[PDB]
RNA sequence: UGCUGAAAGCAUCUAAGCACGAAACUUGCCCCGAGAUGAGUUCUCCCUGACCCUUUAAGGGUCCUGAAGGAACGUUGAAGA
RNA sequence: CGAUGUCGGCUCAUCACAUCCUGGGGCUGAAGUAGGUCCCAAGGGUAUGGCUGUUCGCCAUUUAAAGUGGUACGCGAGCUGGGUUUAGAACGUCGUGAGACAGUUCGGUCCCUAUCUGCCGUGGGCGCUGGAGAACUGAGGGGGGCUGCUCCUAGUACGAGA
RNA sequence: GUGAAGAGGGAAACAACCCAGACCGCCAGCUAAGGUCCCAAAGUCAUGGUUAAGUGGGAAACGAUGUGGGAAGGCCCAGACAGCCAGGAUGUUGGCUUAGAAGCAGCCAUCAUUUAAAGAAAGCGUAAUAGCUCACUGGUCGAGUCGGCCUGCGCGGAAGA
């Protein structure tokens, strides 16, 4: 996944979750857009 | 299970018939008579206390003699203790013989190694000697540097330096037991066990099995 | 919220039993027991269970919604039973079963034996299919999760243990 | 106990009369080579019509060592002079068509079975 | 990396809850280790006398007995400056 | 500035992680073998020579890998003394000259018996509540923790085939 | 202005910062800065909110359905938002470059019908096709909803011997 200081929604079906104090992005269509730690 | 206490008597070699010569250490494992059984009631842990050999009648002090003749044994050289892993019973006074290793396949031996005395760092810690020619001045087998500079300003604890080498308890682990001879009370292990010939060896079944 | 403002209509031989916070439910399929959170009040007024937030606790609605959802899954599991299907897509992959061990042959070098929990049982109508039938959704979900985790679906040939209705997308091999 | 800068005699007839070991292959910080051990050599003296020329870098296997080999009964076999058979660099097969002098039974594995087939004593 | 799962009627590895997960962490292996002043535990052995003084106090003194055991001395050690 | 001995080598190290190898994962323009990139991870390991005073570098041949830094660019009351940096001499250049040169070249005294802290070992005294002989539990502390190659599965999975 | 040439109390320690200028004595009291759970004197004081980060007790651009407040807006029981079943059509495959770009490589058109309504088109993939969908359209469902703005405190960014 992509570690960044900025997590955004690139796709349409990506949603922003907050797990264990980390904001992260999960996409249901494309797995490239999974990203973390913004 | 438990271990047995024997005496190292030399090294020999066994010529097997196929050709391979197995270099063995001979351990005369005599009869170990149980002297005290420590249990959960008095002691909070379970263990047995054994003895082997026999001391002279007058070398045994009164506290040792009363401890021995409290329960049915004659005085031997030294007392030892094995920690009884959960479900074994040895009655007080019981002589334990050497067929316990006629069961087992591998053995670890504990002994006091031979004392080299005050050894330098080259013998003790495998330090590399400095260059024995090329101008060197009174500094061939000296340790070298022992610390950095002003920021530690001190030698760190556990620094490898010259000191007493040997004469310490060491355990050699997972030796192949070659032959258990009950008729002469001989136990033969494959390899070199610690200690000079005559020192006492604690012989246990191998735990890294 | 809109979840917690909807009662669980409990039918036909319910056996609802509350002690303090804990609820134990027996039915025809089996018995399940939930240790509930402090924030939920359960109500068996008028033969049907409702769920309410507690005074003082902040997130009463989230705890009430998860309590209503878990109790609904609990009663529908002890009533009708949860059935999860898995398929072994792949050449050579077999799924023999004996007793309560599942003997997966996922072709590594050694066989795979998976132990099963108490209520869950696995029946194999094909050598490349598993159907596991049980009381709790959590237990059958974790068993299906471990069985899929033995060999997850490859994105090229689709080989592996797979949820029978989950669609895997294929990519081209360069 | 062949190390770096050891001069070895040459058992086969690739042409080298006398070579020098430049690295004991296999493993990091390795010191010595026994009879079952591959080394890298370079050639110092060659025959004028031979296959290999002086100043080449290739590989050899030791076949005789003055330190010897110790058989499992405890017996040692100490040859007089260290000797090697020159192998190819990446083929790892001998470059000779014959082999001089005796070799050791602890060399007997497949490629060096092809070596000891030419050997007059094992 | 998941399972169930609301807040957010869905979705969601997390908020309630649960299971995985590395040579790192705590143990398991080996050694020192009760000066661990918190100075531990167990087993055994050893001593079972008279009287004085003064501010009669965990007192001082006299005579007799020296116990287990230790130390010294010697012969010494694959123990050792 | 009533003195804090400096580059390199040797001996001995020790810590940080911004990880070289090994270990665990996500994405791949990831079929496989092999890569790339990023996250977690400091337990252990982390070449030998030629040249040069050299560190560095280039090269040769390896290795699982030949990590990046801190420690007075760690370490001279631990060793060396090649460079550099005294006095001799010479070259080129600058100067009328004495002399000068981050320009070379040859040669050229490296002192100290450890008081205190620190560390490695090793004892004496007293304590542990009458004295003594042994055997232990174990608070705690330390050591150790590396890895290749070949074979089997299987020449199967994958792949047009290699 | 203080130190130099100035002690005392505070900032853990800390000339130069804050309070305050030591003639000597006192086993007296009120205060300043700073504080009042324990070390360590004095509030585990009272009332009303915030914070979940050990923030408080180190750090920016930027990121985020973290949370508390304030003001207005878009749609909504002539039924909204999120789910769940159907539709997504014709002149018509839109006019061509192009083997087909049969709505998604490029220039022009982006207009006219059936009807509860459907863009001559927005992501993907295929020689073009196909197809999932997205706009949008009715039934169900039963009420709030989804966005911006200004603000208080938090969160990540945030790795060294």
UniProtKB/Swiss-Prot annotation, chain A:
GO molecular function ontology, one term from the record? structural constituent of ribosome
Q: What InterPro entries does this protein map onto? A: Ribosomal_bL36, Ribosomal_bL36_sp
Q: Does the keyword Coiled coil apply?
A: no
Query: What Gene Ontology terms for biological process does this UniProt record contain?
Result: cytoplasmic translation; translation
Please give the superkingdom of this protein's source.
Bacteria
Annotated keywords: Ribonucleoprotein, Ribosomal protein, RNA-binding, rRNA-binding
Query: Which GO cellular component term is one of those annotated?
Result: cytoplasm
Family, according to the entry, reads as follows: Belongs to the bacterial ribosomal protein bL36 family.
* Protein function: One of the last ribosomal proteins to be assembled in the 50S subunit, it contacts a number of helices in the 23S rRNA, acting as molecular glue. The simultaneous presence of uL16 and bL36 probably triggers ObgE's GTPase activity and eventual dissociation from the mature 50S ribosomal subunit.
Under HAMAP family, the record lists: Ribosomal_bL36
What is the protein name given in its UniProt record? Answer: Large ribosomal subunit protein bL36A
**Record organism:** Escherichia coli (strain K12)
Swiss-Prot record, chain B:
Query: What's a GO biological-process term for it?
Result: cytoplasmic translation
Q: Name one GO molecular function term.
A: structural constituent of ribosome
Does the UniProt entry include the keyword Ribonucleoprotein? yes
Q: Which InterPro entries match?
A: Ribosomal_uL3, Ribosomal_uL3_bac/org-type, Ribosomal_uL3_CS, Transl_B-barrel_sf
Q: Which Gene Ontology CC terms are recorded? A: cytoplasm; cytosol; cytosolic large ribosomal subunit
Where on the chain is N5-methylglutamine found, per UniProt? Answer: 150
User: Does the UniProt entry include the keyword rRNA processing?
Assistant: no
PTM N6-succinyllysine: list the residues: 38
Domain of life, per UniProt, equals Bacteria
Coiled coil ranges (UniProt) are none
Record note on modification:
Methylated by PrmB.
List keywords of the entry alphabetically: Methylation, Ribonucleoprotein, Ribosomal protein, RNA-binding, rRNA-binding
Family, according to the entry, reads as follows: Belongs to the universal ribosomal protein uL3 family.
Functional summary from the UniProt entry: One of two assembly initiator proteins, it binds directly near the 3'-end of the 23S rRNA, where it nucleates assembly of the 50S subunit.
NCBIfam families, alphabetically?
Answer: L3_bact
PANTHER family named in the record: 50S RIBOSOMAL PROTEIN L3 (PTHR11229), LARGE RIBOSOMAL SUBUNIT PROTEIN UL3C (PTHR11229:SF16)
Q: How does it assemble?
A: Part of the 50S ribosomal subunit. Forms a cluster with proteins L14 and L19. In pull-down experiments interacts with CedA.
For this entry, the protein name equals Large ribosomal subunit protein uL3
**What is the protein's species of origin?**
Escherichia coli (strain K12)
Q: What is the lineage of its organism?
A: Bacteria, Pseudomonadati, Pseudomonadota, Gammaproteobacteria, Enterobacterales
Which gene specifies this protein's sequence?
Answer: rplC
